Amino acid sequence: DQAGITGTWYNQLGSTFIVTAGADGALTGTYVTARGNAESRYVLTGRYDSAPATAGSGTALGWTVAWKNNYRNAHSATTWSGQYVGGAEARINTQWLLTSGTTEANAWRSTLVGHDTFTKVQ
Amino acid sequence: QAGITGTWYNQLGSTFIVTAGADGALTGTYVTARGNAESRYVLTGRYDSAPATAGSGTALGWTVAWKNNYRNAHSATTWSGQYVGGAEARINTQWLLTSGTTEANAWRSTLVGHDTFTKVQ
């Protein structure tokens, strides 16, 4: 549920996902790239299904990071879409789209696709 | 399909020349807008060779590796979508363009997009 999503997560490439899940469906927090210093922290916001349908069902969620902070700006934004699965080995399985600002001529190269799995910190 | 078989054009000016085998094979040539011989690439794919139902599309996909005798872009695109028959025949697709990368750069190896093909230039 919400106590389950709220916390600190890490993906397979070393990034950190620090999130609070609200009772109203809000996701808010900080995304930290693998370098882990101050210039590596970005704001994230998103939403999740705060009343999932069964107990064996995953919890649908989504969030966005625009890759601008006080130090750097990559003129791009990533959205992650996926599900939280609780239990012993709780996980967040996602697919993501990374879009860069481009000219109309280069829009074909604007959007990368991938996937990330996050596991929680003990 | 002798419906699918033919010459198709996407929004950008690219041309898709395909034979649909009776069994479900797609074979042909993808020609980039530039037109000339260095712009022609081999394609192969598959489609659902069942007869079409009541106003439902026919599933298909195909691949192009962007190497020919002139050029090698070290990359391959797959298009997945469906064929809609009738008078205003259309192939609506989503595509994935993957580039060969080192393992450090694999995370940015695959672009996603969409294309729509018709038989009208």
Binding site: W108, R109 | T32, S39, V64, W66, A73, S75, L97
Partner: peptide, 7 residues
């Protein structure tokens, strides 16, 4: 920067 699919 360029690619034949979009030339």
């Amino acid at each position: 920067w360029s690619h034949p699919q979009f030339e």
